[PDB]
Nucleic acid binder design. Structure first.
Lengths: 38, 176, 142, 209
RNA sequence: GCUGAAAGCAUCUAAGCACGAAACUUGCCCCGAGAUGAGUUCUCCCUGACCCUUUAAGGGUCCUGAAGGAACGUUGAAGAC
RNA sequence: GAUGUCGGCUCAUCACAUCCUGGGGCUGAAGUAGGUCCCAAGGGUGAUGCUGUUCGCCAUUUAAAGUGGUACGCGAGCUGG
RNA sequence: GUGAAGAGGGAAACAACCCAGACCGCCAGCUAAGGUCCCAAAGUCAUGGUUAAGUGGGAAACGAUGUGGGAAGGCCCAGAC
């Protein structure tokens, strides 16, 4: 998990979802891209 | 929206009853009851169920869609139910169903024993796979999930409990 | 002429019972406070306790809006250095539910000896039963 | 489970056949006589109140004498209560003896520790002493600093400093039961228990499991 | 994580349901009803006259002195007192 | 018309930007061992040589030898290098 | 301009900010700045809208299918996404 102030879509398969108020990027292609805002 | 605006058709031999907000479904595989949230109203039309939002509620359409999907899966459950297949891969990994308890051997130094819930029945066609059958989709999904959670597929051989259909996408260590 | 003042000896106090089921915490507490102080009678005087005794039942059924049920936090210090201790709304309801209403009302009352005396006139009960039937409380709708 | 009230007879050892010396505390527990039984309906909780020993009738006050008369038991030297588990019930006047601990093998013992009196900070709280030499002047066993500068401006609650030590209730947990001797009214537990010789002890089955 | 729409797909969340740490609330030990919100239980003791007046109150005299307590003494593995 | 100043000793107390122990995500994570980030402040967190030293460098340990605030915490508590 | 050399009301408390310049007395009335659920005087006032964080009641570059409203634009019942 990358915890950073600027989360972005990195590939086509990575996707943005607001879980519990916090913005997250979950990417099915590979776990390297999984991100969180913080 | 589109989901809510597609009625669910009850087959013959399944029974529904709507007590205000609580829906109860009779079927050959048994009973499924669920209380809908206040923002959705449901009408028993001719051998069908129609879902719509209450008035004075925001996001009523989202609740209607969720309720429609829940009830469709419900009626799909009371007939034939659902089943989930799990595989065990890895040397010495075994499963055995005894009564309502699953005996697993995922290479631990202790025995692992999983208690099944009320409506779920397990059976192991062979030594290294499990088949769960149940009526309610959520419960059987949950059972498969926390059965997988005992030893989830590691990314170098796929060893551990996996869903029979899921892909693992293993990788390899460095060279040298 | 001089302005009238109520006498502590000859003031008339009545008994009421309030059912706090589904009522908003603060909206109930303000009315409780103004009735304990005596602000609802034409012979109210600031330095005399002219209020009524209030029985509150079903203190555990009190309601709060928003996310306060898990987010409102009650803090208190024990006087030692660890000291600071906290409990959310739901933990207070589970431990001693009569305390949430007691604390709200105590906050809304005046401070000092007279405010303490006014607070002494409130009887909060978790359940639906009270043992003050001899005082014949009459139902007050808030 | 309930416990019993005993007396610290003293301390000795038990020599085992394989050549091991076990230091044992000897607790004389006589019959404990149930003087009261408390239940939810009348008292709000379940317990049994026992007495033990005996005391001279010329200074059992009339209130105490009347209390013992209801149970129909002989006056003892004190009264102690024991909370009841969900299972057991007792009857007023019943006598409980040492074979309660016949197969317990681990007990907690509660007593009143020996009173050390007004003790200083070194003995009470294991404070380091200061230098005995190197210019130290009148401060060899004193506590040192007791706080910070102006910012707190006060000494904190619970600060460790000299005062009364001892003479207070102490519980020692998970003591092995070396033996139970029913006819001599004796309990031999391994180790040392609080209190001086001849003082009351409360023995309970171990709660620490 | 499960089920699941908004967004006919996906989605751990919006409704609903699970797990999850030496932190938190308990569980273990001690103090604790001056908790003036001063709690409960058990036991014991005391059921005599008369006068006065500013009375709804009280004051006083005689007789009585309980249960207990304190004081004193001999003291204590209790203790500066 | 006085707020005693460096370091040591004694005694601490809080913050968390976590040194260890606890829980996790990603790894250029096979295992062992690591890297990095997130949650976590319950408890723990060396005794020596040199120097007034704080520091530092060394010698040996340790699970670890945390970083800071507290008048660079503490002289109506000690020392006085 | 104010304080100095100016009190009174508000800004929680707050010389110097806001309102306003105390000759004395009144248990009379109207207002200013500020306010009107309770502490604490006065709207739990009316109509229309917004926000769901306790935002209101601390803080930027930057990031995001949070929602509320406009002005336009494509893709399309020959079938769009």
């Amino acid at each position: 998990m990358k915890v950073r102030a600027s989360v972005k879509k990195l590939c086509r398969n990575c996707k943005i979802v607001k879980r519990d108020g916090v913005i997250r990027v979950i990417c099915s292609a590979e776990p390297k891209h999984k991100q969180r805002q913080g | 929206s589109r989901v809510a605006k597609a009625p669910v058709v009850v087959p013959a031999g399944v029974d529904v009853k709507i007590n205000g907000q609580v829906i109860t479904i009779k079927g050959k595989n048994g009973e499924l009851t669920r209380t809908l949230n206040d923002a959705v109203e449901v009408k028993h039309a001719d051998n069908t169920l129609t879902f719509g939002p209450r008035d004075g509620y925001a996001d009523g359409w989202a609740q209607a869609g969720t309720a429609r999907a829940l009830l469709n899966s419900m009626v799909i459950g009371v007939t034939e139910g659902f089943t989930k297949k799990l595989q065990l891969v890895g040397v010495g990994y075994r499963a055995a169903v005894k009564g309502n308890v699953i005996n697993l051997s995922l290479g631990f130094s202790h025995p692992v024993d999983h208690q099944l819930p009320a409506g779920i029945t397990a059976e192991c066609p062979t030594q290294t796979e499990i088949v769960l059958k149940g009526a309610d989709k959520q419960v059987i999904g949950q059972v498969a999930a926390d059965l997988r959670a005992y030893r989830r597929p590691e990314p170098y051989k796929g060893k551990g409990v996996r869903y029979a259909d899921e892909v693992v996408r293993t990788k390899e260590a460095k060279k040298k | 002429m001089k302005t009238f003042t109520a006498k502590p000896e000859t003031v008339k106090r009545d008994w009421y019972v309030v059912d706090a089921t589904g009522k908003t915490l603060g909206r109930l507490a303000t009315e409780l406070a103004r009735r304990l102080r005596g602000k609802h009678k034409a012979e109210y005087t600031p330095h005399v306790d002219t209020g009524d005794y209030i029985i509150v039942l079903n203190a555990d059924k009190v309601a709060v809006t928003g996310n306060k049920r898990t987010d409102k936090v009650y803090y208190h210090h024990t006087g030692h250095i660890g000291g600071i201790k906290q409990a959310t709304f739901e933990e207070m309801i589970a431990r001693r539910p009569e305390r949430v209403i007691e604390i709200a009302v105590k906050g809304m009352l005046p401070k000092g000896p007279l405010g303490r005396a006014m607070f002494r006139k409130l009887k909060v009960y978790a359940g639906n039963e009270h043992n003050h039937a001899a005082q014949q409380p009459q139902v007050l709708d808030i | 489970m309930i416990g019993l009230v005993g007396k610290k007879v003293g301390m000795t050892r038990i020599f085992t056949e394989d050549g091991v010396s076990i230091p044992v505390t000897v607790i004389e527990v006589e019959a404990n006589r149930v003087t009261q039984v408390k239940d939810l309906a009348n008292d709000g909780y379940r317990a049994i109140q026992v007495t033990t020993g005996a005391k001279k009738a010329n200074r059992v006050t009339k209130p105490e004498a009347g209390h013992f008369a209801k149970a129909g038991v002989e006056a003892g030297r004190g009264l102690w209560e024991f909370r009841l588990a969900e299972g057991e019930e007792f009857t007023v006047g019943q006598s409980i003896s040492v074979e309660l601990f016949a197969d317990v093998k681990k007990v907690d013992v509660t007593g009143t520790s020996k009173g050390k009196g007004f003790a200083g900070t070194v003995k009470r709280w294991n404070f380091r002493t200061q230098d005995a030499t190197h210019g130290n002047s009148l401060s060899h066993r004193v506590p040192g600093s007791i706080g910070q500068n102006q910012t707190p401006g006060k000494v904190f609650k619970g600060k460790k400093m000299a005062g009364q030590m001892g003479n207070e209730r102490v519980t020692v947990q998970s003591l092995d039961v070396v033996r139970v001797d029913a006819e001599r009214n004796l309990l031999l537990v391994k180790g040392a228990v609080p209190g001086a010789t001849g003082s009351d002890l409360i023995v309970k089955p171990a709660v620490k499991a």
